[PDB]
Amino acid sequence: DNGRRGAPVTNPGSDRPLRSLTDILSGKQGRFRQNLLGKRVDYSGRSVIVVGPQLKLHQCGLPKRMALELFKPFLLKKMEEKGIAPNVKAARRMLERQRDIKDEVWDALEEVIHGKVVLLNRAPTLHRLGIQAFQPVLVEGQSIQLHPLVCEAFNADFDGDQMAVHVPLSSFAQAEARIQMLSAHNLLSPASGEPLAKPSRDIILGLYYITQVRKEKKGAGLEFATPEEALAAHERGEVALN
Amino acid sequence: AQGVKLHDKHIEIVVRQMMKYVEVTDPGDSRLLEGQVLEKWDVEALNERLIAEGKTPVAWKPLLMGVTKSALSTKSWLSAASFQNTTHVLTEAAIAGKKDELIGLKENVILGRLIPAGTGSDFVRFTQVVDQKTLKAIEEARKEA
Amino acid sequence: AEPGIDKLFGMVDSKYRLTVVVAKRAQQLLRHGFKNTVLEPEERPKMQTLEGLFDDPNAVTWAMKELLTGRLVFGENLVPEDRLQKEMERLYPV
Amino acid sequence: KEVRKVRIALASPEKIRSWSYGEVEKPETINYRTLKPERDGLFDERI
Amino acid sequence: MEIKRFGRIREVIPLPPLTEIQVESYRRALQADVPPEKRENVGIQAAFRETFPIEELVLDFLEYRLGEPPFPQDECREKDLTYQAPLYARLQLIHKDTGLIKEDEVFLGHIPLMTEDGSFIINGADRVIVSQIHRSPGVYFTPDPARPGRYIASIIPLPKRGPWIDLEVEPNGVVSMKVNKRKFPLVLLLRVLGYDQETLARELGAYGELVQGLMDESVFAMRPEEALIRLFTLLRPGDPPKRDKAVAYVYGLIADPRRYDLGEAGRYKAEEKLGIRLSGRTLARFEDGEFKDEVFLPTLRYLFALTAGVPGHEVDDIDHLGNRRIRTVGELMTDQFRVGLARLARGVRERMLMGSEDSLTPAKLVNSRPLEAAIREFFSRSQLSQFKDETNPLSSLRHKRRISALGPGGLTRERAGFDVRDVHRTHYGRICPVETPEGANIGLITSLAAYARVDELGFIRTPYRRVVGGVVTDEVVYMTATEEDRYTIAQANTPLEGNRIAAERVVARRKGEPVIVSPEEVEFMDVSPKQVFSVNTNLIPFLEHDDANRALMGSNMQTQAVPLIRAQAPVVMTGLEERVVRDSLAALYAEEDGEVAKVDGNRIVVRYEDGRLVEYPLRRFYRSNQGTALDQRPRVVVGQRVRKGDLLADGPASENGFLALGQNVLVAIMPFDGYNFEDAIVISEELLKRDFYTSIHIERYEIEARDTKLGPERITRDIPHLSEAALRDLDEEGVVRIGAEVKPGDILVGRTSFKGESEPTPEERLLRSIFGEKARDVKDTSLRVPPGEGGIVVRTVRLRRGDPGVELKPGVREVVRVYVAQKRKLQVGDKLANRHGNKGVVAKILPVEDMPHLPDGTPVDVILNPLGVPSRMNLGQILETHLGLAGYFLGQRYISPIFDGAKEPEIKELLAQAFEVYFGKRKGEGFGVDKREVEVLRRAEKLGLVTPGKTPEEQLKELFLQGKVVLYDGRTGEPIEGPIVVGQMFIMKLYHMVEDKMHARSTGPYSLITQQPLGGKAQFGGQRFGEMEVWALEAYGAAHTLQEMLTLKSDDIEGRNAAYEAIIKGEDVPEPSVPESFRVLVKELQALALDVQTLDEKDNPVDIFEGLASK
Amino acid sequence: LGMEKTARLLDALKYYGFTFSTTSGITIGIDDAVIPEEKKQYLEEADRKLLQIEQAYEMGFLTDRERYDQILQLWTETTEKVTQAVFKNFEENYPFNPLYVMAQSGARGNPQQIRQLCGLRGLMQKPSGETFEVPVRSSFREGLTVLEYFISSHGARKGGADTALRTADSGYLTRKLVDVTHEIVVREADCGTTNYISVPLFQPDEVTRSLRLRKRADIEAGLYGRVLAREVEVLGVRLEEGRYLSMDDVHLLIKAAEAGEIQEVPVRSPLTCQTRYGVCQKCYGYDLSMARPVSIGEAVGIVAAQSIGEPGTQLTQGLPRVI
DNA sequence: CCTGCATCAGAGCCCAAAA
DNA sequence: TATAATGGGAGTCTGATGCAGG
RNA sequence: GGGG
Ligand SMILES: Nc1nc2c(ncn2[C@@H]2O[C@H](COP(=O)(O)OP(=O)(O)OP(=O)(O)O)[C@@H](O)[C@H]2O)c(=O)[nH]1
Ligand SMILES: [Mg+2]
Ligand SMILES: [Mg+2]
Ligand SMILES: [Zn+2]
C-alpha cells in the first residue's frame, strides 16, 4: 500500500505516486468499481437522438450503418444462407470496403433483425427506465430516432443528447427484453405507481386546443322568452353565438 | 414538499436494513460477548436453538445504524469490499476466514454469475416446457415394465 | 406491445416464469429446426421479404404465439431433463 | 463442479511458497539488445 | 443594403486592444526590443537579478540577449517544431580566493515566442496560456469563526515564495503565530527581532488585557541570540541547534529576498493597509548582524487595535476584486523560468567544489538542461497551457481572455466551495457575470469584461467618466475595485442634454449597492453598458430581454460556430461584430493608402503611396486544431482605390468584415407535427439546395515507417495479396494520388512490416503449399480509412531521413501525412442554435412543397416550436424575429446595441413600412384579399388580435405590427387556423455533427490486463456499461441479458470466442464461463498474500484456472 | 382495458395531438406577453407604502431590522397581486392567448415564469442569502436595465453552483442506497407473519390542537397497493384479509374516514416481514409499474434505491435533510 | 467519566480526453 | 586502488472513531 | 477547458 505510511514512492523526476497493489484494488478506478461491477461491452454503439413522431410506442429509428456493425456476425451467416457471398470469410471481406457493399446486403440485414429488439440507454441512468427495449426500424442517416412518449423516463431532449445501443444476443436475453423491458410493457412508474408514458408538450397542447370552448362577451346574458326570438336576435348581430 | 409522489413502500425497505443489527446485553449461556454486534436474524435463529436446548437465551438490544455502516456490515465480504473501506473490510474478512455464500446481487455480478433475481430466481429458474404431443409420447413408453 | 401480452401474464404466477417458458421453448424450436411445433401451417408466423412470404425466423415470436394456443404444458418436475432431450431428438431430428 | 462459495483467508509463508513457480533473484527485466526476458528476472519464462 | 443604427449612447472610448492581455504581458517579460542597459527589473530580467551572484568563487550575471527565430511561424507549424528564439547570457567568473576573471556568453537553450495574435506554437500545434485568478499577496484580517469576538491575521506571500502565516489569539490570552501548520507563542519571535518588554508595552499597551497577555517572562530572560536558538528547537526537532544553522533556516524562511517574496502588489497592499512603508518584499531583514522587524509589529499592532474596536480597522473580504489579482502569461512563464534558473544554480555550486578550483570558465560551469526542461515543461504540460480553440476567429479571441481559478497554485475541483464561484459585486465592469461554464466549473472559469484591463500589479481595472458638478467630462479614469468603492457612480444610460446630466434623479451605485441620488452627488459615470459583459455576451442583440441562464448558452455557443462557405453576418447586430474580426487578425487590412495592383485566389498585391509593392499572400484552406477550414478570400478588385485600414481579404466566418457565425434564415414559430418535439428543429430542403449551413472540414492522417529488429518498415506501392482494384488511386510510391475520392476501407499510404516469429504456423504452411505461393516475408500494414470517415485527398507531405532539413525521432525512417477534406451539407442530427440560447438538433428535412409559406408563395426556412420560449424566458429571440421581418421586406440590417437598443415602438414603425411592400405590391398587381385570409381574420377577431369592424387590409396590418402573418400549409393548402409569427433570425451550425459522433462495434480491441473492450470511437471501443446500467438490468430482473454484458460481450475469453463462432454458424450462443477480470482480481489478492478460494457446496475447492496454475 | 390497448390509446393520443397542434395556430410574438392594466395601480400603491416605512425609520419609530423586514413583505405581496392580475386578465379578456394556453394545459410554463414575462421580475438575492430591498420592476417584455440585470445575475450563479454540487451528493446517496438494499429480493409468497403496521389517516394538527384528515396524495402514498392485515368493514363494505387495495379501495377508505368510521388501516409492510434475505409478496404489495401484485423474483431493493435516488437531483430543509 | 482532537477515507453517470 | 575530505534539502471540507488529558 |  504505497503512500499509506510515509512519503509516497515516486518515479524520479515526477510527482506522481506509483500505483501499488492497494490502489489497483480500491477506489472509483479500482478493480472492483471499474472492471468487476461494470465493464465496457461488445455489440454496442452510440449516436445523437432525434425525435420520431411517426414511430409506434415499441419502436426506434436505427441507422442502417450502425445496425450492420451490431449484427455483423448475424449478417455474415445470413449472407451465406441466401447467396451474397460464398462463405463467412469472404462475406466479411466485402463489408470492409464501403464501396464493395452492394444493395442486396441491406435486404439481407432486414431479414436478420426481424422480431429482435435492441436496448436504448441514456446516461445518467437514474431508475430502471434509463434502459428500455425497442424493435429497431432501419433508416438512412446517422441519427437514432426516439419515440416521443418515452422522452420523460429518459429525461431526454433533442438539444443534442446521445443514446447508447446494445444488442441482446441469446434467445434468453431477447425474451427478457421483449417481455420485461419493452417500452410498451412499462407504462407506469415503479416509484409512485402513476402513468410514466403520458401526454406532454405538443400532445397536451393539441388536445387542450380542440377541447376548449369559446366564451364570448357580445350577448352579455340577455333573457329571451322564446328560442326563436334568440336566433332572430343573433341574426340581427346583437348577440354572439357562444 | 418538493412535489415528488413516492410510495412509503420503498423508504420502508431501506429503513428495515437500517435496523438489521443488534447489540448483546447478556449472553446468558452462549458463545457471544456483551457488546458484540450481530444481525437480528442470526441472534433470533440462535435464540430458538437455545430456548429449545433449555439454556438461558441471549439478551439483545435494537440497534440503529445509517446506510453506510449497515452496508459495510453485511455478512458478504464481496459486497462490503466492493462498496468502500476496501482494505479494512478485506483485512477483517481474511482474519475471520470469512465465507461469502453469494446470497446477494453484487457478489454474483462480480463473479459474472446469473443473479438471484428475475429469470435467475430459484422460484422460476427450473420451469420446464413440453408440448402435449411430446408429453403423451414420453408417457406411454414408460408406463410399463 | 407484444400481441396478447396481457393474456400471457395471466397464465403465470410470476412474470419471470413466463420469460423462462418462452425462452426455453424458443431454444427447443431452434435446435430442432421448428419441426416440433404445435402450430398448424396457417398459424405459422410469416415474414415478408423482397422475394415474398417465408417462415418467421424468430423463434421467440413463435414461442409466445404457441403459448397462447394452449397446446404447451409448463411447470416444475414434469419429466427428467435429460430424458426429455432424447425423446425430442428422437421425434424431431437435428 | 459448480462454484457455490468464496472464502478469503491469510496465507502462511509456506503457502505463499506453495503457489510459487520460482524465486525472482534479479531486478533485471528484459535484455536490452534481444528484448527477450532476463534469466531469473521478473519476466523469466523458466518461472 | 442600408444599416440602421439605434441607441443614444455616445461611447467616449473604444474597446481596448482585445488580445492585449496576452501580447502586452509576454512582451513585458521578454523585453526583447529593449536595449539591455535600459531594461527595468521585471520578468526575465528580474529572474536573473534574483538568482545571481552565485556564492561558493563567484559567478556574476552581466546581461542576456534573445536571438531571432531559427524558423518562421508557418514553417514551425509544418515540421512539428516549436516557434522559439535562442537565448544567450553573458557571465563573468570571479574567483573569491584569487582575483581571476573569465567572461563568456553561454547558451541557455531556446525560449518560445508569442505570435502577433497572442498565441504560441509548441511542437507544431497552436496553444494558448490562460490567465489565473488567485488571492493577492499582502496582509489580511479575517474573523475567527470559533470565537465571535476575536480575529486571525494571515500574511500570505506570492505562491511557492513562502509559508502561510496565522496569528490566532488563543484562549489563554497570549498571541500565537502559525507557520507550516505548527504553532508557538508569538512573543518568542518578537524577542529574536531584538524587542524588549518596554517596546511592546509602550507601542501597544493601550489595550489593557490583550498586550499583557502577550508578555511572557521566561522568554525575556535571554538576549536575542538565546531566543533564536530556543525557537529553532520548536520548529525542527532532532536537528542540532548550531548558531549558523539556525540563522540560515530562519533567514531563508523570513528575511531572505530569494526564498521569501511578497508581491509587488503585496508590498503596496501591506504599505497601504498597515500604514507603514516597506524597504523590500521580505517580512524582516538581516542588518548589522541581528534581525530587524518590518511587518510583524505593524501586523500585531493592527490586530490588537481591531479586537479593541478602534476606528479605522476593518475585516477584509477575500473575494473582493481589489484583494484578488490576475496572474498573466508573463508572470506564469516567469515563475517557471525562476524555478529553472535556480535548478541550474545547483549545478553551478556543485561544480565549484569538484574538478580543480581553477581550470573552469563560465561555459563549462553551466549545464542548461534544468532551465530548458522547466520552460519546455511549462509550455508542453502545464494546466494553463491549452490547445487553442480556433473553430472560428471568435473561439480563439475568447479563449485568450479567459480567467481560471484552477491550475498550479489555485483551487482544485474537490477543493472548491461557494464563496469563490459567486458573482461578487466588484465583478461589475471587470469579470463577465454571464460567460462561465455550466456544470462542475461554474464560477471558477470566467471571461474578461470588454472594457477591463489588467494593471501592472495584476488587479483588473474598469473605465469610468469623471463627473464634476453636474457636467460629465471626457476624461476617463481606469479604476481598481478598492479605489472604485470611494466614489458615487451613475449609470451609463442616465439622460443627458449635451454634456450636462439632464435628470433630477439619477440611478447610481455606492459600493455596488444601488441608490437614487441627486445630480449634485454624482462623482463618476459608466462608460457604456458594453463594459459590464464579456465579448461573447456583447454579441447577443436584445440581451436586456433574455433570462441570464439562457444568455449564458448564447455566449458559449458562438464559440462553437463552424465556419460556413456562405457565412453571413446577422441582420440584427450589436455593433461589436466589426471590432472582433479586426482584433482577431483573421481578416486582412491595408497598411498605408494605395492602389490595388493585383488580386488573385492565392495573393493580393497592393501599390502604396510609398511606391513599395507590398505583397500579401493569402492563407487558403488551412486546417485548424478542430478541423474547421481557416481560409481567407479576396474582397477587392484590380485597380481599386484603398485608404489606410480598408479591407483586403475576408477571413473565415466573416463577411465584409462583420463576424458571420451562421446564416440568416426565414423562420416560422409554430409546432409542426411532432417533428418540433422537445427542441428539435425542422428545416427546409431549400437550405441544402442553395448550400446554406454547408461547411468544409479537414481531418489529418499520419503514418511512420521505422526501423525494427526484424527489418525496415517500407512505404511502397507493393502490398501482398491485394488486387489492382484496391490500389488504383495510389501513385508509384504507395501514396494516394492528390485529387482522389477515398471512402472507408480504402488505402491511404501503403506500408509493409516484417512478420514476427509467428512465421506462419504449420496450418498456414500446408495451405500455402497447395496454391504454390511462398509465404511472403512482409505483411500488409497499410494505413487505411477509419469507419465513417473519408473525403477528397487534398495534400500529401512525405518526410524521410536523409532528406534536407529533416531528422525524425530515433529509429524512424520516414513520416507521411495525408490531408483529407470533406464538404459537409447540413443533415439530420447536426446541431443548430441562435444567440439567445435556443439550441436543437435537426430532426426533419421537408421538401419545399411541404413547408409552410406566405400568401405570395415564399416558403419559410426553419420551423421552431413555440414551447421552447415560455419556460426558458429568452425573449430576445422574439424581438429579434420581428425586427427581422421588417428587414426582410425593407431590405435592411440593423445595429441594436445592448440595453440601449431598438425599443418596441421604433420596431413597430419599421414593421408598418414593410407591410406596404408586402401588400401594396399585391393591390397594384391586381389581387385582392384572399378567401382564406378572411377565415383566419375571423379566428383572429375572436382572439382579440385585430379590432372588429375594419377592412381586411386594416386588420392584416394590425397583425403584421404584432409580427404575425397568414401562413398556408403546403400539404393541405388550407391556412393555419391562426396568424403565426414569421421573420428573419440568425442561426448558427454548431461543431457537434452526427458524422463525427455515430459509432458502433460488434467485436474489437481489448485491454492488456483486463481483456475488456477499449473505450472511445477512435479505438473502435465498446460502450461502457457501468454500475448504474447494471442496476437498471437488475431492477428489471433480466438476468441472462445482464450475464451476457458481464461475460460474452466483455472479458469472458472462452465464451466470447465461442459465442461469435455460434452466431456465424447459426447456433445459439453458449452459456458463459468465468470472466477473465475476476481471475485478475484473484491473482491480485494473492499478490497481497491473501488466499482467495472458490468452493463447491461440499466446501471443497473449485479450480477456476483449469489446472494451469498448480504444480 | 390493459397494457396492449393502452399502448394503442397512447399512440392514438400521440397521433391526433401532434396533427392539431400544427393547424391550431399557436405562436409567440412579443405582444403575447400582456402587461395588465392593474400593474401601474399596484406599483403606485407599493411606493406610498414604502415611503411610509421610511418615515418610521428616520423618525426612529422602527429599527433597521424591522424596516428591511417590512419592505420585503410589502414587495412579496405586490408580486402575488400582480400575478393574479396577469392570470385574471388572461382568463376574462384573452382565454386563448398562447402563453396562457401553454401554462394552463401544462404544455410548458408555470405562473412564476409567466409573471416574469408580463409582470415584474420581482425580488432578487444578494450573494449571501439575504434579499435586495430594491426589486427588478421591469419584465422581459419591457426589458431590463444593466443594473437590474447585474443584481439578478448573483442568484443565477448561486443556483447554478448549488445544483452542480448537489448532483454529486445525490449521486453518492443513491450509491449508498443500492449497496445497503441490493440483496433484498421478493423470495417467497407468504412468510406467514402475523405482524403488520397501522397507517394513520389523521395527523395531529398543531393549529386546531386536535386532528385533521391527512392530505390525499400522502395517504395514497401510504395505502395504494398494500395487503390488508385484518378485515375492515366501513360503509357496509367488507374489505377482506389479504386484499390488495386498489386505488378505488383507497378512495373508499378516505371517504369512510371523512364520515368518522375508520381512523387507521392495518396493512402488511416490508418493515414487519419475516422473510430472510428479502421480503415476501404480501408484505410488499403491488408491483406499481404493472398495477397488480408483484411477481416473486422482482428485485425490489434495487427498485427502492432507484425510486428514492432519481428525484435527488431536484430538491431545494432540502436534500441535506434526507441524507 | 467525559471531552477535545487527530488521522483517515469519503466525496454522480456517460462521451469527447487533442497525448 | 593512497594530499585530505566525516550529520539532507523541502509542501480543502465533510463525518466517524479511536486516542491521551482537565 | 468541451456534450447531455
Ligand atoms: N447527471 C447529469 N446530467 C446531466 C449533465 N449534463 C446534462 N445533464 C442532463 O441535462 C438535462 C437537463 O435538462 P433540461 O432541459 O434542463 O430539462 P427541464 O427540466 O425540462 O428544463 P427545460 O427544458 O428548460 O424546461 C438533465 O436531464 C440531465 O440528465 C451532467 O453533467 N450530469
Ligand atoms: Mg437534454
Ligand atoms: Mg428539457
Ligand atoms: Zn412478509
Side-chain angles (χ1 to χ4, degrees), chain A residues 122 124 155 157, chain E residues 550 872, chain F residues 108:
Chain A
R122 176 236 180 215
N155 201 335
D157 290 308
Chain E
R550 231 59 200 191
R872 276 62 183 274
Chain F
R108 259 296 189 179

Side-chain angles (χ1 to χ4, degrees), chain E residues 335-345 368 370-372 374-375:
Chain E
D335 246 50
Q336 285 317 93
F337 192 92
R338 172 170 299 106
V339 164
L341 226 50
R343 298 228 179 81
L344 177 141
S368 69
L371 183 57
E372 301 177 74
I375 299 299

Side-chain angles (χ1 to χ4, degrees), chain E residues 589-609:
Chain E
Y589 303 88
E591 291 185 33
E592 223 78 34
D593 299 77
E595 184 182 321
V596 176
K598 289 185 177 182
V599 169
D600 212 19
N602 311 323
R603 54 106 181 100
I604 297 173
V605 183
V606 177
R607 167 62 71 79
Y608 287 145
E609 61 161 33

Side-chain angles (χ1 to χ4, degrees), chain E residues 477-494:
Chain E
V477 177
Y478 273 97
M479 294 185 166
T480 64
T482 308
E483 193 199 340
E484 173 191 311
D485 281 4
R486 265 181 78 239
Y487 317 104
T488 300
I489 311 180
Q491 283 291 317
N493 73 359
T494 49

Side-chain angles (χ1 to χ4, degrees), chain A residues 21-22 24-25 31-51 53-54 63 65-66 69-70 72-74 76-77 88 92 96-99 119 121 123 125-126 128-129 131-132 142-143 148 151 157-160 162 164 166-173 176 180-181 186 200-202 205 209 214 216, chain E residues 671 673-675 677-680 741 743-746 827-829 831 839-843 865 867 939 942 977 994 997-1003 1006 1009-1010 1012-1015 1020 1022-1025 1027-1030 1032-1033 1035-1041 1044-1046 1048-1051 1060 1063-1066 1068-1069 1077 1080-1081 1084-1085 1087-1088:
Chain A
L21 249 42
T22 292
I24 293 173
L25 282 198
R31 193 66 76 214
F32 283 121
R33 293 173 70 178
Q34 205 65 63
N35 321 104
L36 254 324
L37 296 176
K39 302 174 155 76
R40 289 200 185 279
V41 288
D42 284 335
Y43 302 128
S44 68
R46 138 177 308 257
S47 191
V48 166
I49 64 176
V50 131
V51 66
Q54 84 295 339
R65 311 226 146 248
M66 283 187 63
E69 190 62 32
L70 297 165
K72 204 187 257 165
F74 302 97
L76 297 176
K77 179 55 191 132
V88 177
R92 192 171 194 141
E96 281 176 332
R97 302 188 81 224
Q98 199 204 66
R99 50 173 74 154
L119 304 182
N121 173 225
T125 302
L126 303 183
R128 89 179 169 190
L129 298 137
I131 301 186
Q132 296 178 206
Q142 301 297 255
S143 279
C151 286
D157 290 308
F158 306 95
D159 52 14
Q162 298 172 41
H166 300 271
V167 177
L169 300 184
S170 67
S171 286
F172 236 103
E176 286 175 309
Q180 309 169 208
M181 303 179 54
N186 303 261
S200 62
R201 310 291 176 220
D202 297 27
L205 190 68
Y209 174 91
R214 304 221 182 98
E216 294 165 56
Chain E
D673 264 36
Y675 291 112
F677 190 66
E678 283 283 33
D679 307 273
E741 185 192 22
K743 292 182 120 185
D746 286 5
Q827 67 185 186
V828 178
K831 185 184 182 196
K839 49 162 170 194
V841 120
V842 169
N865 194 310
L867 285 179
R939 327 284 314 211
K942 277 117 197 296
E977 290 173 22
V994 244
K997 314 196 169 182
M998 188 207 89
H999 174 54
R1001 166 197 166 119
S1002 46
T1003 57
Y1006 299 100
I1009 303 71
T1010 59
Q1012 303 178 355
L1014 302 184
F1020 209 69
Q1023 296 298 311
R1024 168 151 186 89
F1025 203 77
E1027 248 188 298
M1028 312 178 74
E1029 287 66 26
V1030 174
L1033 290 198
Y1036 274 146
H1040 285 80
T1041 302
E1044 279 188 357
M1045 244 60 51
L1046 303 175
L1048 306 183
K1049 275 178 266 175
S1050 222
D1051 46 68
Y1060 184 99
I1063 297 175
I1064 64 178
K1065 281 183 165 185
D1068 209 9
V1069 312
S1077 282
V1080 168
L1081 172 77
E1084 271 160 337
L1085 285 159
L1088 278 159

